[PDB]
Design a protein around this ligand. Structure first.
Ligand code: 5DH
Ligand code: 5DH
Lengths: 9, 231, 223, 10
């Protein structure tokens, strides 16, 4: 889930 | 936590500084069609999503939520937020939709696409008649983020979200009492603003099923597909 | 014009007396449950149309405008009615007094829509929604949902807002609690819109999959 | 016309 990227960055 | 301790002015400032930039499209003129336009809108929305995610984190209260909850809220509201952003920057362009500073369109070129264009134009006219303020807008947008998926995801937790929403409501009222509105006008304008969110939901729902239909037929971002196959 | 001259109390009484009756269904496998809901919704529509004519301001509209507003909000109004009378039955949907359902039987086809409806019912229960507030929300839906697809309608919407506030100040809510509860109520309308849209495309896929009312076919083949 | 038309007039 690419949405998990950015959201934990 | 902490977000429930902000004053109204601090709330407004937080949202204003959190505002995502206005992006340009890859629109190269001297050459007009369908699919190409949808490709530009897809390319644009793809890059906006990255800014929206980072914007969403700066929204007071959002960070306090579970990772899974953050995912769900964005999955539900991403098109609503894109559209109210589109409508907002299209205000001073009557009869036109300002997708990007270099991409201004009227209902002509966008010809089921036409139905959504008119609804977006109607919302923009409504904002213009209401003389919507930037402080009000950033409130509405952050309300969409927290409200659009609150009834789809003992955990609650969803009580915290409602507590923040109440804080934004107080913020909105604070703004209206500042602009010299009487208490009656404050309630009415508040009601007027939140009833538009119904149509913003409607436009998103209509746009969502339009994107679903052509998925079986234009190419979409790997992030946009992630969003679609989750609603 | 007459609607704009009402008092808040007169506005409340007008809407309460305008309330449509609660209908019974024909007393579940797939297609049978859909038949019952279709039959029930068909008969409810006849009452809604007359109810709509009793909503202050609605009569002052052009016939084509009345048609459009109803074509827009008919499923919304049905759903908020269902959710309202399902309040005192947690985890259940009271379609009719002789037709109470939980999400279990609604799996034969739909599960997603039931959960959303149950979620709205839980939200009303938690908010302790009053009947006076409910009839105001419903009439707002009728006047707002199709208003962009008009100044008079906005004057009436403001009137109902004043009515809602009047009700809340009556119950002893502080001014802060007044704009907060107002916001909370109107934000649920976004979800009711969302449920209608989801239910609408389900009926659309159901129509060209094959029966339903010729009136219900108006409401679909105009949406 | 529409069935809805006569419902609103009757
Ligand atoms: N207007 C509009 C739509 C947008 C969109 C287009 C293609 C996509 O793949 C995703 C979204 C859009 C809205 C705002 C914005 O800032 C950028 C793009 C749209 C969506 C669905 C159907 C029709 C148009
Ligand atoms: N819940 C629900 C739905 C209703 C419905 C079912 C069949 C129809 O042909 C029309 C409406 C319904 C809602 C409220 C009410 O008082 C009676 C019926 C529904 C609609 C679409 C999809 C799933 C359910």
């Amino acid at each position: 889930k690419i949405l998990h990227r950015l959201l934990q960055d | 936590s902490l977000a429930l301790s902000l004053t109204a002015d601090q709330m407004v400032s937080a949202l204003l500084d959190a505002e995502p930039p206005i992006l340009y499209s890859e629109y190269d003129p001297t050459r007009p069609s369908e699919a190409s336009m949808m490709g530009l809108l897809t390319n644009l929305a793809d890059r906006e999503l990255v800014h929206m995610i980072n914007w969403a984190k700066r929204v007071p209260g959002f960070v306090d939520l579970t990772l899974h909850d953050q995912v769900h809220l964005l999955e539900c509201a991403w098109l609503e937020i894109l559209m109210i952003g589109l409508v907002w920057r299209s205000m001073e362009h009557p009869g036109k939709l300002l997708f990007a500073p270099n991409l201004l369109l009227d209902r002509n070129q966008g010809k089921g696409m036409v139905e959504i264009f008119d609804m977006l134009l109607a919302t923009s006219s409504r904002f213009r008649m209401m003389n919507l303020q930037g402080e009000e807008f950033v409130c509405l947008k952050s309300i969409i983020l927290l409200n659009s998926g609150v009834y789809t995801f003992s955990l609650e937790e969803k009580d915290h979200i409602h507590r923040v929403l109440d804080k934004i409501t107080d913020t909105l009222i604070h703004l209206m009492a500042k602009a010299g509105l009487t208490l009656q006008q404050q309630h009415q304008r508040l009601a007027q603003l939140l009833l538009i969110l119904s149509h913003i939901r409607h436009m998103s729902n209509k746009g969502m099923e339009h994107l679903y239909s052509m998925k079986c037929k234009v190419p979409l971002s790997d992030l946009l597909l992630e969003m679609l196959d989750a609603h």
